Scaffold this active site. Sequence first.
Site, PDB file in Angstrom:
ATOM      1  N   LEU A 139       0.820  -1.211   0.000  1.00  0.00           N
ATOM      2  CA  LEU A 139       0.000   0.000   0.000  1.00  0.00           C
ATOM      3  C   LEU A 139       0.858   1.267   0.000  1.00  0.00           C
ATOM      4  O   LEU A 139       1.897   1.314   0.651  1.00  0.00           O
ATOM      5  CB  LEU A 139      -0.931  -0.008   1.216  1.00  0.00           C
ATOM      6  CG  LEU A 139      -1.933   1.142   1.372  1.00  0.00           C
ATOM      7  CD1 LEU A 139      -3.333   0.577   1.523  1.00  0.00           C
ATOM      8  CD2 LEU A 139      -1.572   1.974   2.586  1.00  0.00           C
ATOM      9  N   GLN A 182       1.298  -5.585   1.641  1.00  0.00           N
ATOM     10  CA  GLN A 182       0.137  -6.000   0.861  1.00  0.00           C
ATOM     11  C   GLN A 182       0.606  -6.719  -0.400  1.00  0.00           C
ATOM     12  O   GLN A 182      -0.113  -7.547  -0.957  1.00  0.00           O
ATOM     13  CB  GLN A 182      -0.729  -4.791   0.482  1.00  0.00           C
ATOM     14  CG  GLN A 182      -2.095  -5.166  -0.094  1.00  0.00           C
ATOM     15  CD  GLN A 182      -2.937  -3.954  -0.500  1.00  0.00           C
ATOM     16  OE1 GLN A 182      -4.074  -4.101  -0.959  1.00  0.00           O
ATOM     17  NE2 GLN A 182      -2.383  -2.760  -0.337  1.00  0.00           N
ATOM     18  N   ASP A 198      16.128   8.995   9.580  1.00  0.00           N
ATOM     19  CA  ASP A 198      14.991   8.305   8.974  1.00  0.00           C
ATOM     20  C   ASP A 198      13.740   8.614   9.792  1.00  0.00           C
ATOM     21  O   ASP A 198      13.534   8.049  10.864  1.00  0.00           O
ATOM     22  CB  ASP A 198      15.229   6.793   8.947  1.00  0.00           C
ATOM     23  CG  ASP A 198      14.180   6.048   8.133  1.00  0.00           C
ATOM     24  OD1 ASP A 198      13.075   6.591   7.929  1.00  0.00           O
ATOM     25  OD2 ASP A 198      14.452   4.908   7.704  1.00  0.00           O
ATOM     26  N   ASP A 251      12.318  -0.877   7.129  1.00  0.00           N
ATOM     27  CA  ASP A 251      13.683  -1.403   7.073  1.00  0.00           C
ATOM     28  C   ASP A 251      13.675  -2.644   6.177  1.00  0.00           C
ATOM     29  O   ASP A 251      14.668  -2.967   5.526  1.00  0.00           O
ATOM     30  CB  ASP A 251      14.189  -1.820   8.462  1.00  0.00           C
ATOM     31  CG  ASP A 251      14.328  -0.655   9.424  1.00  0.00           C
ATOM     32  OD1 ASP A 251      14.724   0.448   8.989  1.00  0.00           O
ATOM     33  OD2 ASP A 251      14.062  -0.851  10.630  1.00  0.00           O
ATOM     34  N   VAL A 278      18.499   3.665   5.471  1.00  0.00           N
ATOM     35  CA  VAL A 278      18.791   3.938   6.874  1.00  0.00           C
ATOM     36  C   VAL A 278      18.065   2.976   7.802  1.00  0.00           C
ATOM     37  O   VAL A 278      16.863   2.756   7.667  1.00  0.00           O
ATOM     38  CB  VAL A 278      18.409   5.386   7.260  1.00  0.00           C
ATOM     39  CG1 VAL A 278      18.650   5.610   8.752  1.00  0.00           C
ATOM     40  CG2 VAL A 278      19.227   6.374   6.436  1.00  0.00           C
ATOM     41  N   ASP A 322      21.038  -6.351   7.785  1.00  0.00           N
ATOM     42  CA  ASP A 322      21.087  -5.760   6.455  1.00  0.00           C
ATOM     43  C   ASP A 322      19.973  -6.350   5.592  1.00  0.00           C
ATOM     44  O   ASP A 322      20.012  -7.524   5.246  1.00  0.00           O
ATOM     45  CB  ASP A 322      22.443  -6.054   5.806  1.00  0.00           C
ATOM     46  CG  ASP A 322      22.599  -5.402   4.438  1.00  0.00           C
ATOM     47  OD1 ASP A 322      21.589  -4.943   3.860  1.00  0.00           O
ATOM     48  OD2 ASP A 322      23.739  -5.358   3.931  1.00  0.00           O
TER      49      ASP A 322
HETATM   50  P1  LIG Z   1       1.512  -2.761   3.825  1.00  0.00           P
HETATM   51  C1  LIG Z   1       0.150  -3.127   4.807  1.00  0.00           C
HETATM   52  O1  LIG Z   1       1.132  -2.667   2.286  1.00  0.00           O
HETATM   53  O2  LIG Z   1       2.091  -1.387   4.425  1.00  0.00           O
HETATM   54  C2  LIG Z   1       2.096  -0.082   3.810  1.00  0.00           C
HETATM   55  C3  LIG Z   1       3.504   0.501   3.754  1.00  0.00           C
HETATM   56  C4  LIG Z   1       4.281  -0.282   2.737  1.00  0.00           C
HETATM   57  C5  LIG Z   1       1.205   0.868   4.596  1.00  0.00           C
HETATM   58  O3  LIG Z   1       0.168   0.143   5.329  1.00  0.00           O
HETATM   59  C6  LIG Z   1      -0.764   0.822   6.130  1.00  0.00           C
HETATM   60  C7  LIG Z   1      -2.156   0.480   6.117  1.00  0.00           C
HETATM   61  C8  LIG Z   1      -3.080   1.158   6.930  1.00  0.00           C
HETATM   62  C9  LIG Z   1      -2.633   2.200   7.779  1.00  0.00           C
HETATM   63  C10 LIG Z   1      -1.257   2.560   7.814  1.00  0.00           C
HETATM   64  C11 LIG Z   1      -0.324   1.873   6.994  1.00  0.00           C
HETATM   65 CA   LIG Z   2      14.509   2.647   8.211  1.00  0.00          CA
END
Ligand SMILES: *[P@](C)(=O)O[C@H](CC)COc1ccccc1
Ligand SMILES: [Ca+2]
Length: 320
Positions: A17, A88, A242, A288, A296, A303
């Site tokens: 997401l 996701q 970061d 990370d 960072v 790593d």
């Molecule tokens: P994944 C669940 O795809 O994480 C996302 C960052 C890569 C963001 O996910 C969310 C979903 C709902 C609220 C905050 C972050």
């Molecule tokens: Ca980081």
Amino acid sequence: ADNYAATRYPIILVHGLTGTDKYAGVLEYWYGIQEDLQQRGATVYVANLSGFQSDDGPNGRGEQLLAYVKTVLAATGATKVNLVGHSQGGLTSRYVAAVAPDLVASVTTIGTPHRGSEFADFVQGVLAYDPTGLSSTVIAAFVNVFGILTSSSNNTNQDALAALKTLTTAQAATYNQNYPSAGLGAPGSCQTGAPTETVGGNTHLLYSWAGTAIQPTISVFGVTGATDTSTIPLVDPANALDPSTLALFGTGTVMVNRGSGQNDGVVSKCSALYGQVLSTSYKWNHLDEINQLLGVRGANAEDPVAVIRTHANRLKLAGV
Ligand SMILES: *[P@](C)(=O)O[C@H](CC)COc1ccccc1
Ligand SMILES: [Ca+2]
């Protein structure tokens, strides 16, 4: 360069997401990872899907990935690909593995909310407290625009509301009923499933790992406090260079207070379990995992580039 990561089938990285292959066409989601893998002899492609959408459905990320997988096969001449999804992205990969098993050789998920996210429930709950419902519209419009603007291709197919719902725990359970998997354990068991699956006669090697930097360390008066084990207490530079480090510690605290247990700020350990669980000990917050932001990470964090590189080798040795 060498062929340490030279897998038989092309590797496709799948963002989660808010993601895109390259933020604003400038910052790559999988920071330095495609470059590293290619230097080690791997054929890698980076999917560019809607940053905000459900995974199934006519306009979902699943059909988008399926179509992309097909163009990768046609361009390379390969018959299958290895799906490596983050967050996701792991759900989107499971979708392709299920509806087009013949095109997948393996599925690896990194910090993927197979059982949903307690933070997703939280955010959704927040919106529900507006008796007028207008905040959903306004905020959804804002997020959708962010999606269109940050998409490398300015993809206008963004649906923040549907993306948020998709990530809630209740919806995740439903997703697992519609798209079952031998690599999944019983819901509410906090257990994984099998290391491989055979769907329609096609075998898939299943793998996963999770970040558990955010640990519950103290409980008082019903309140649970956490600790970001990825950083050296207080003085870690990652907290200054970061911005997502502390933010994820903050969202991780909301999660442990919602019964999540150890997490990476967005996905709990139990929710990330899938196929062969290589590890859940990495002292990583959610970003990370993809070597972000800009490579960072706290002083105690492993790593991420090396971990992903080693996995490509693992896949190679496994025959995919
Ligand atoms: P994944 C669940 O795809 O994480 C996302 C960052 C890569 C963001 O996910 C969310 C979903 C709902 C609220 C905050 C972050
Ligand atoms: Ca980081």
